[PDB]
C-alpha cells in the first residue's frame, strides 16, 4: 500500500529554461517530451509523475534546491518508474518493491497517479 | 499491479455527434449518460474511465464498457480484443472511479494480476 | 477499491460555518485554517473524504489526518468504520493535490 497524486498547471513548466529542464529531467525523459506534439504538456505530465511517485513512497519529504532527476519516468509502451540515488535508497529503506505510474493532461493541467508496493 | 489515469475537458465530448458517440459507447453506456443531469459531463466521465482502464491494462473503445449506476461504484466489463489482451496479460480484475467538475473529468483505474 | 474526486477550489465556501462544522472534524478544521490557502486546503480535504468514500464501495465520519512534510492518513469513525469492516476493508490510503483551479484526491482500499 502506497498512493500518490499530483496535478500541475501546464504553464508551470518553462521549457526555454535549459538549466532547470536538464537539472530535473534525465536525458531519456527530455528526449521523449521534446518528441511530443505538445512539449510543455509533456514535461508537465512527467513532472506530475515524478511528484506523484515520490509521494507514493511516503518518505522524508523533499525541498528546494532538491532535484527530482532521481525519479525517472521511462516511456519507451506504458510508463515505467526507475529510481536512483537517494530516491532509490529511501525506497528500499522503506521496503518499496515496485512503483507504477500513470499520466494524463488536457488543455488546463496534468495529473499523475502512482501506487507503491511494500 | 496496474494503474491508469485519464483527464478530459468536458467539451471534448460532442453529444450531438451521433457517429462518434455510437462508435465509442455501448448502448447501455449511452442510455446512462443521457439520463444524467449533465449529459456531456457524463459522457466525458465515461470516456475518461475507458481511457484510464485501457492504460491500467498496460498492453475504437467500445470494447471497454463502463457499467454505471448512480450511488454504486462503476463496473468495468471488457470485450473483444480488450478482453483477450487482458487475459493475455494476466489481468484478473479492473476497478475504476470517475469524477468531474465544471472544467474537466478525471478517472483512475487499478488493475490486478 | 479505488476512488477519485476532483473539486473546484471555489466549491468550498469557508464562510459557510454550517457546512464546514458539519463535515470536518476539529483537527481537520484546525489544519486547514493553519494553511497558506485555507480554501484550497478545505477543498483538498473534502476531495480526500469523497475519494475515500468511493474506494470503500458501499462526511465527518471520514477523517483525514494531515501534518506537513508527511503523507495524509485516513482514520475512519462511526458508520464509516463499521461499513468498512463490514466490507472487509483492511486499509485505506489517500493522496491529495491542488493547483489554482481545483483539488484532486485519489484513494485506494485494501481487502
Residue C20 Cα, gap to closest chain A Cα (Å): 24
Question: Residue A70 in 3-state DSSP?
Answer: coil
Q: How far apart are CA B85 and CA B91, in angstroms?
A: 9
Q: How far apart are CA B98 and CA B51, in angstroms?
A: 11
Give the class (CATH, top level) of B1-113: alpha beta
Phi-psi sector, A53: left (phi>0), alpha (psi -120 to 50), beta: alpha
Closest residue by Cα to residue C93 from C78, C110, C81: C110
Closest residue by Cα to residue C48 from C79, C73, C11, C19: C73
A62 at interface of C, judged by CB pairs closer than 8 A: no
* φ, ψ for residue B99, nearest 5 deg: -155, 160
Chain C, nearest residue to A12 by Cα: C99
Helix A27-34 × helix A39-57 angle, to 10°: 140
Which CA distances in Å does B61 have to B14, B79, C100? 16, 10, 32
Q: How far apart are CA B44 and CA B11, in angstroms?
A: 8
Superfamily of domain A1-118: 4'-phosphopantetheinyl transferase domain (3.90.470.20)
Binding residues of B for Mg(2+): 6-8, 99-100
Q: How far apart are CA A82 and CA A69, in angstroms?
A: 10
- Provide the H-helix boundaries in C17-77: 17-23, 26-33, 38-56
B112 at interface of C, judged by CB pairs closer than 8 A: no
Chain B, nearest residue to A116 by Cα: B1
Residue A91 Cα, gap to closest chain C Cα (Å): 15
Resolution of the structure in the document, Å: 1.9
Which helix H or strand E contains C94, and what residues bound it?
strand C91-98
Q: Return the number of CB contacts < 8 Å for A and B.
A: 46
Which CA distances in Å does A13 have to A32, A38, A48? 15, 12, 11
Question: Residue A54 in 3-state DSSP?
Answer: helix
Which helix H or strand E contains A52, and what residues bound it?
helix A39-57
Q: How far apart are CA B54 and CA A15, in angstroms?
A: 30
Q: How far apart are CA C39 and CA C34, in angstroms?
A: 11
A11 contacts A110 by C-beta, under 8 angstroms: no
Decide yes or no: CATH 3.90.470.20 for domain C1-111.
yes
Query: What is the 3-state secondary structure of chain B?
Result: CCEEEEEEEHHHCCCCCHHHHHHHCCHHHHHHHHCCCCHHHHHHHHHHHHHHHHHHHCCCCCCEEEEEECCEEEEEEECHHHHHHHHCCCCCEEEEEEEECCCEEEEEEEEEC
- Contact (CB<8Å) A1/C100: no
- Contact (CB<8Å) B5/A108: no
Contacts of A113 in chain B (CB under 8 A): 3, 5, 108
Q: How far apart are CA A19 and CA A39, in angstroms?
A: 16
Q: How far apart are CA B20 and CA B30, in angstroms?
A: 11
Q: Which residues contact B94 (CB under 8 A, 6 or more apart)?
A: B2, B53, B56, B57, B76, B78, B86, B109, B110, B111, B112
Amino acid at each position: 500500500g502506497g498512493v500518490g497524486v499530483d496535478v500541475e498547471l501546464i504553464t508551470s513548466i518553462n521549457v526555454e529554461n535549459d538549466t532547470f529542464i536538464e537539472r530535473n529531467f534525465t536525458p531519456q525523459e527530455i528526449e521523449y517530451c521534446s518528441a511530443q506534439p505538445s512539449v510543455q504538456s509533456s514535461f508537465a505530465g512527467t513532472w506530475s509523475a515524478k511528484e506523484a511517485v515520490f509521494k507514493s513512497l511516503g518518505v522524508k519529504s523533499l525541498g528546494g534546491g532538491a532535484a527530482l532527476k532521481d525519479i525517472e519516468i521511462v516511456r519507451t509502451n506504458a510508463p515505467a518508474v526507475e529510481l536512483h540515488g537517494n530516491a532509490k535508497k529511501a525506497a528500499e529503506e522503506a521496503g518499496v518493491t515496485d512503483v507504477k505510474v500513470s499520466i494524463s493532461h488536457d488543455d488546463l493541467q496534468a495529473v499523475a497517479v502512482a501506487v507503491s508496493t511494500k
